[PDB]
């Protein structure tokens, strides 16, 4: 769509609809990252009655709920309701009227009184960042939620969620998994369409200052591996997205280079020609990512660039040096590269069960494990790694 299509009267009308909804609290039922399965309960008040949040819905087609209730209070209720005592509960929560509803994002509106501190993370990208968009578009069938953690292409949280947790910030995700098989649930779109969608929802928020959002952007992996997109087209999509984000007032952006995805187990079933071909696109596109970062820095923006490509090379070249045991095999017992495998549950191999999925780089044949996503977040959070340039709150 386009944020300009939303009129002032429409904003007033939308924001004046003060309804209420319930909160679905998801948690990991098993007690380690080896088990992706999740279940849920409705959030409760302290006395056990159902918890509700007041606010308003808006959707272009995919409804988001806008509330004044803080994310920290919603999380606290879910934690109090579920009372999970194991270590990997990995609780997440969503708005829903009833059991037939999908998992809708809860957006906390900002206060009128606001300075220049970062107050949220907004993520753009593909299956390396998606936390539930293709999963909801696929009616919770893809990727299968017994084996991939509730709509994440991993066995747990992805890197953006670990960053958000470290900084105690909400994460609002626009990234869309474009893994093999996604096409059947939503036509391929660029990352610039994610920026457009985000800007339309942001127009319905109250007191929204785009300069207080930390934007994260990674894109291209699914485009190159699965869709054979040309580098020049991905360049055009990526630069168009940054133009649109900065034109809308973004100031704080985290970028990352693409990992060399030809190191993934699925390329055991590929030709050397395809390996060299995909790899070359990634090498070329990564130089464009770096050049865009340098350009926006010179233009005065707060840009960090993390060389995820170089980090992945270190992990796949010498996993033991970085706390991992295996960087060549899928942890899951998947012995081919097929889109249909995301529809089914899969067991761990004996070797992965022996060492634990936290010691593997790869979960299935394509995507990294949640331990890798954590390793990335920790590297990005490290002193001197660049996040010092953003205006974060402190928390005692």
Chain residues binding Br ion by CB under 5 A are 363-364, 366-367
CA 42 to chain CA mean position, Å: 23
CB of 362 to Br ion, least distance (A): 7
- For the bound state, the minimum distance from the C-beta of residue 325 to Br ion, rounded and expressed in Å, comes to 18
Check: CB of residue 135 under 8 Å from CB of residue 176: no
Nearer to Br ion, 95 or 180 (CB): 180
Q: Which of 295, 296, 222 is nearest to 258 (CA)?
A: 222
| H-assigned helices in the chain | 8-16, 71-82, 133-137, 159-166, 191-204, 221-225, 231-247, 272-298, 308-317, 350-355, 370-381
Query: Which lies closer to Br ion via its Cβ, residue 107 or residue 149?
Result: 149
Min separation Cβ 29 and Br ion, Å: 20
Q: Which residue has the tokens 């022996």?
A: 354
Give the H or E element holding residue 58.
Answer: strand 52-58
Q: What are phi and psi of 217, to 5 degrees?
A: -140, 120
Residue labelled with tokens 């501190």: 117
Which residue bears the tokens 């994310």?
A: 71
Provide, rounded to whole angstroms, the least separation between the CB of residue 273 and Br ion: 23
Nearer to Br ion, 196 or 334 (CB): 334
Question: CB under 8 Å to 321, separation ≥6 — which residues?
Answer: 314
The tokens describing 220, both together, are: 């291209």
Closer residue to Br ion in complex, CB, 108/357: 357
Angle, alpha carbons 132-226-258 (nearest 5°): 75
Cβ distance to Br ion smaller for residue 67 or 366: 366
Min separation Cβ 288 and Br ion, Å:
26
What is the number of the residue whose Cβ is closest to Br ion?
364
Q: Which is nearer to Br ion, 162 or 342 (CB)?
A: 342
What are 377's two structure tokens? 């977040």
- The count of C-alpha atoms lying within 13 angstroms of the C-alpha of 95, restricted to the half-sphere facing its C-beta, is 23
Q: Given the complex with Br ion, which of 263 and 367 has the nearer CB atom?
A: 367
Q: With respect to Br ion, which residue has the nearer C-beta, 101 or 335?
A: 335
Least Cβ distance, residue 368 to Br ion (angstroms): 8
Whole-angstrom distance, CA of residue 332 vs CA of residue 234: 31
CB 226 to Br ion: min, Å = 13
| CA nearest neighbour of 302 among 377, 368, 392, 233 | 392
Instruction: Tell me how far, at minimum, the Cβ of 330 lies from Br ion, in Å.
Output: 7
Q: Which is nearer to Br ion, 6 or 334 (CB)?
A: 334
Q: In sequence order, what DSSP letters do the residues of 335-354 get, joined into one string?
A: -S--GGGGGS--PBPHHHHH
Could you tell me the two tokens for 33?
Answer: 């990252």
- Backbone phi, then psi, for 147, in 5-degree steps? -125, -30
Least distance from C-beta 67 to Br ion, angstroms? 34
């Amino acid at each position: 769509l386009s944020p300009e299509a939303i009129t002032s009267a429409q904003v007033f009308s939308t924001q004046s609809k003060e309804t209420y909804t319930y909160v679905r609290c998801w948690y990991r039922t098993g007690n380690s990252h080896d088990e992706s399965a999740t279940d849920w309960e409705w959030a409760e008040n302290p006395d056990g009655s159902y918890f509700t949040i007041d606010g308003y819905w808006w959707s272009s087609v995919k409804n988001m709920f806008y509330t004044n209730t803080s994310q920290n209070v919603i999380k606290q209720r879910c934690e109090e309701t579920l009372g999970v005592t194991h270590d990997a509960a990995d609780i997440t929560y969503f708005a829903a009227d009833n059991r037939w509803s999908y998992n809708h994002t809860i957006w906390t509106n900002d206060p009128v009184m606001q300075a220049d501190q970062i107050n949220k993370i907004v993520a753009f990208g593909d299956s390396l960042s998606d936390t539930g968009n293709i999963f909801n578009a696929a009616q919770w069938r893809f990727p299968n939620p017994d084996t991939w953690f509730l709509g994440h292409f991993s066995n747990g949280f992805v890197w953006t969620e670990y960053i958000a947790q470290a900084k105690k910030l909400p994460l609002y995700n626009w990234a869309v998994g474009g893994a093999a098989g996604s096409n059947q649930y939503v036509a391929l779109t660029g990352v610039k369409d994610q920026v457009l969608s985000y800007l339309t929802y942001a127009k319905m928020a109250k007191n929204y200052k785009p300069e207080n959002t930390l934007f994260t952007l990674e894109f291209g992996l699914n485009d190159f591996m699965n869709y054979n997109r040309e580098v020049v087209d991905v360049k055009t999509d990526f630069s168009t997205a940054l133009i649109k984000l900065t034109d809308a007032g973004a100031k704080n952006i985290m970028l990352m280079t693409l990992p060399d995805a030809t190191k993934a187990p699925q390329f055991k079933y590929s030709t050397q020609a395809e390996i060299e071909k995909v790899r070359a696109k990634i090498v070329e596109f990564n130089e464009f990512i770096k050049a865009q970062a340098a350009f926006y820095i010179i233009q005065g923006y707060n840009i960090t660039l993390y060389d995820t490509h170089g980090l992945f090379e270190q992990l796949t070249q010498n996993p033991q040096q970085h706390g991992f045991v295996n960087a060549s095999d899928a942890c899951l017992n998947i012995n081919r590269a097929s889109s249909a495998d995301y529809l089914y549950s899969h067991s761990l191999t004996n070797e992965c069960a022996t060492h634990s999925s936290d010691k593997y780089v790869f979960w299935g044949v394509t995507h990294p494990t949640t331990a890798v996503h954590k390793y990335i977040a920790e590297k990005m959070l490290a002193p001197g790694a660049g996040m010092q340039r953003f205006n974060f709150h402190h928390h005692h």
